[PDB]
């Protein structure tokens, strides 16, 4: 057992030890809510509770490839809000930057498409954008798959014209991963090597309600500690018909068999400040946030 | 990761089954093994149950077996339940093939997702079976504080009288013990799985799309050396990892890849796949006799 106790304090002590060389961060929409971007599944405020005007059969249909090919209009109307480049990164994002600058970040796997990891200064090599990007777009026809740049797709979205491919007249969509679509090739190539050598999983701002991303927590070695920083416990629940996690694939924070998983419940920004304080990084983190935000405000 | 099959074919499985290494077989079955009996499955286009619920005006097909939707709108399920009641059909060749595995001392367990009871009618006993998605046999009040049990005849009476079954003690809804989405699986599912998959020598997967958890996880619970044979109309368990996939990452079948070492896909009718495997094992005549007499015996009632 690598943690001396199942607390943030225990995780911090482990992080400072020579045994903790490589950290993987797994993040979702929760890490961007304090920047002003709603998550997906939070009641009332979440995106899936705010799609009534689109008259969908159910909320998730707006990001389902099969529904999209039949009724693409709602997604492209919503896309005007989803397009990145008008929010600043959060304290949580800069904490991951700090991990990078301390030589501790093996990888950040993100489910987000807001690009705040990149704006916060994480580089392409540090990142797996697991659910894709707006940066590039592709024709949906597998036979054709013609690629279109951000400007091309952006021009179509903000002109309210449904993007059609110039070669085959099929729909063109941004490379954000829809339900039913394959994840980027980088996800799998990085996963297979990263998870053999990870010393700590830092899971932040995700409900772990979607596969294959939810599987990642179970790819780590059994000895690797896992810290969740989130408003609610995620990944720990009793099995039931239609559960997302595979049997035994979840977190165990609270059973009498718990040995490596720690749930810090609260806001991601505040959890990262608390961890930073325990590591003696709090002033460094605060200075980085202040400087980088002021640098963004400069333009 | 020892390779126990000499070749990734049905003939290689048959040879492995005849060797001394193969002592314990587990069957994992779904609605595909019962369509030839006249019971449609769930997810097949046009024929499947989920494509034939228009009359109930559901938000989506699965709602009719979702516990939250049920409590709020119980009427549609109970209307459908009149059709779901088991005992108007005969078991299939596939069911009798599993019975033959029992009698040959090869069957450790059959885990079924079905509630049609055809495994029992074919001669599999309580001890041989894990009815993973429950049963009509018993019914219970839905209130966690009460859980008052009701017998088969009590639920029938309410269903065919078209009265929504209510608890005589606490007046909460009473439903048959079939597992709805969002509900716990039977205790027996977990207790059996914990021990059964430690020393299983062969997995026989038949007539399922492996589209629901936690049942879909069962193929990953076998040792990495245990061969796995799929007998199904379509390939299931093998797919490129996509957003919203049911299987956990790397928890699927590997039939077609370069690394493929233990998994075999026999594509076609479950009954025909079972007849074919039986022939390779020398049981063809024994299986056909069993099916004839049992069908006759049921008709002879
Ligand atoms: N400030 C905060 N601090 C801590 N936790 C938070 C905060 N805000 C929200 N949360 C928690 O953060 C979590 C947000 O969960 P979800 O909204 O499901 O986002 P995902 O990234 O996991 O969604 C994954 C995919 O699903 C979609 O289909 C898309 O494809 C997504 O990429 C919850 O547990 C909140 O309590
Ligand atoms: N005669 C046949 N021979 C071979 N394969 C067949 C045959 N007929 C159908 N199939 C295949 O059989 C498969 C039928 O798959 P599904 O209809 O999803 O049934 P499940 O048992 O997996 O459903 C699991 C749960 O989901 C529900 O919510 C309930 O809770 C269920 O208990 C397909 O791959 C067919 O191609
Ligand atoms: Zn095209
Ligand atoms: Zn009751």
Residue numbers in the entry:
A (entry chain A): 57 to 355
B (entry chain B): 55 to 355
Sentences from the paper on this structure:
Sirtuins constitute a family of NAD+-dependent enzymes that catalyse the cleavage of various acyl groups from the ∊-amino group of lysines. Sirtuins consist of a highly conserved catalytic deacylase domain of around 275 amino acids that is flanked by unstructured N- and C-termini that differ in their length and in their sequence. Of the seven members of the human sirtuin family, Sirt2 is mainly found in the cytoplasm, while Sirt3 is the main mitochondrial deacylase.
However, we succeeded using conventional screening methods and obtained crystals of both Sirt2 forms in complex with ADPR. Each Sirt2 molecule contains the product analogue ADPR formed through the hydrolysis of NAD+. The structure of Sirt250–356 in complex with ADPR is very similar to the structure of Sirt2–ADPR recently published by Moniot et al., but everything is observed in greater detail. The asymmetric unit also contains two very similar monomers (r.m.s.d. of 0.19 Å for all Cα atoms) that adopt the ‘closed’ sirtuin conformation. However, the handling of the Sirt250–356 crystals turned out to be difficult and the crystals obtained were pseudo-merohedrally twinned. Additionally, we also provide an improved crystal structure of the Sirt2–ADPR complex.
